[PDB]
């Protein structure tokens, strides 16, 4: 699908997409497309309207079709833009001009690999150490070549519930990761994610409630 779209930027952050909106002209109806960072397989739509950027999450439905939350299904993300370019339907305005990728610029692929496969890809990742107790997690973090932001994720007493251990000025910080009814992982009062690696890539880029940003993953035993 949308890997060859001129306005598909990729796994860029929400802020970076807004910077491109100011580079494009911020004319109301200017839009671009990027990869969603907290909804697996879904997309995100960044539209500028009234001197502000507006973001809409294009979720991938169960049948393989993409649709906005509380909306009608579209074959591909391009079709959704084409539909919303002629019909407003719940958005701020109609999509007028796309902001094609500037020259030199390619789709940004992040450490997501730098449905089934995604859900069980964390087992082999360096920051995931599996099921360990709290005392074991702090020991393993405290005894290596340590540096601020060194972290790991462990499985809590529940299978499906995880816990984040982060190093901050000699102290191992413990953050709880809980599952909701939908099945989305989130830190208390934090943004919800579909997978753990999306939680890592978000928190390794911005503090967002944490005392510091995740940096280097602790190597697993």
């Amino acid at each position: 699908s949308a890997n060859h779209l001129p306005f598909f930027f990729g796994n860029i952050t929400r802020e970076e997409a807004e910077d491109y909106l100011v580079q494009g002209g911020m004319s109301d109806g200017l839009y671009l497309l990027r990869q969603s960072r907290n909804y697996l397989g879904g997309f995100a739509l960044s539209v500028a309207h009234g001197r502000k950027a507006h973001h809409y999450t294009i979720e991938r439905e169960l049948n393989g079709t993409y649709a906005i939350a509380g909306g009608r299904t579209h074959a591909s993300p391009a079709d959704l833009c084409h539909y919303h370019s002629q019909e407003s339907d719940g958005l701020v305005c109609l999509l007028k001009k796309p902001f094609n990728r500037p020259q030199g610029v390619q789709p940004k692929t992040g450490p997501f690999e730098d449905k089934l496969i995604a859900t069980t890809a964390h087992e082999k990742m360096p920051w995931f150490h599996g099921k360990i107790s709290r005392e074991e997690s702090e020991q393993i973090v405290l005894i290596g070549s340590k540096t601020n932001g060194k972290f790991l994720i462990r499985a809590r007493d529940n299978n499906g519930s995880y816990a984040l251990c982060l190093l901050h000025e000699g102290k191992v910080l413990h953050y709880r990761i809980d599952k909701d009814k939908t099945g989305k992982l989130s830190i208390p009062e934090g943004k919800k994610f579909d997978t753990l690696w999306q939680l890592v890539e978000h928190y390794s880029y911005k503090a967002d409630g944490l005392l510091r940003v995740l940096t280097v993953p602790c190597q697993k035993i």
Side-chain angles (χ1 to χ4, degrees), residues 1-114 117-134 136-180 182-190 192-219 221:
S1 282
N3 306 83
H4 28 233
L5 290 210
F7 52 89
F8 177 69
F9 294 155
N11 186 8
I12 59 169
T13 88
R14 176 196 81 170
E15 291 83 3
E16 300 185 334
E18 295 182 341
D19 286 321
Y20 280 156
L21 285 180
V22 186
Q23 179 180 316
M26 283 288 292
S27 56
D28 52 76
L30 194 75
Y31 68 100
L32 58 94
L33 204 64
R34 54 169 174 102
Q35 191 184 334
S36 173
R37 319 190 83 246
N38 55 337
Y39 289 85
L40 180 65
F43 285 75
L45 181 72
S46 300
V47 178
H49 182 84
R51 337 144 308 178
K52 298 190 158 188
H54 307 265
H55 302 278
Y56 300 105
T57 348
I58 302 174
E59 288 180 21
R60 139 122 197 214
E61 297 286 11
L62 305 107
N63 56 3
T65 64
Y66 315 91
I68 296 188
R72 136 230 227 98
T73 31
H74 295 85
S76 76
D79 293 18
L80 181 146
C81 288
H82 178 44
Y83 166 89
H84 278 280
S85 179
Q86 37 182 318
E87 283 276 343
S88 161
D89 208 8
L91 269 54
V92 271
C93 67
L94 307 92
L95 312 181
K96 284 131 181 146
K97 176 190 315 183
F99 177 66
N100 298 343
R101 213 169 332 107
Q103 274 294 73
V105 193
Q106 313 229 225
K108 245 235 241 174
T109 268
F112 63 90
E113 221 184 284
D114 304 3
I117 302 99
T119 49
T120 15
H122 57 78
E123 303 253 359
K124 275 198 187 182
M125 295 242 185
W127 39 257
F128 186 70
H129 294 197
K131 168 139 204 309
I132 42 177
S133 60
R134 185 164 182 179
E136 291 169 88
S137 41
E138 46 184 9
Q139 290 180 2
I140 242 169
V141 168
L142 281 168
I143 69 167
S145 30
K146 62 193 69 187
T147 189
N148 266 352
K150 178 175 63 157
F151 75 108
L152 81 64
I153 334 189
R154 54 144 178 151
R156 242 175 73 78
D157 297 299
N158 308 4
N159 291 359
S161 171
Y162 311 72
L164 172 79
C165 313
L166 166 65
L167 182 58
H168 174 67
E169 314 288 351
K171 186 54 189 158
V172 286
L173 303 184
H174 292 85
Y175 288 131
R176 192 173 83 264
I177 299 182
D178 311 309
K179 215 171 188 75
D180 48 16
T182 316
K184 301 183 178 301
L185 310 95
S186 61
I187 290 189
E189 324 299 334
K192 304 214 175 183
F193 301 85
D194 287 358
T195 51
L196 277 179
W197 67 269
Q198 291 174 357
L199 187 147
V200 172
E201 199 174 15
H202 168 78
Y203 279 139
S204 62
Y205 167 80
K206 183 199 307 177
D208 194 8
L210 312 190
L211 272 293
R212 76 184 308 101
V213 294
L214 315 177
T215 68
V216 290
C218 188
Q219 79 276 64
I221 185 177

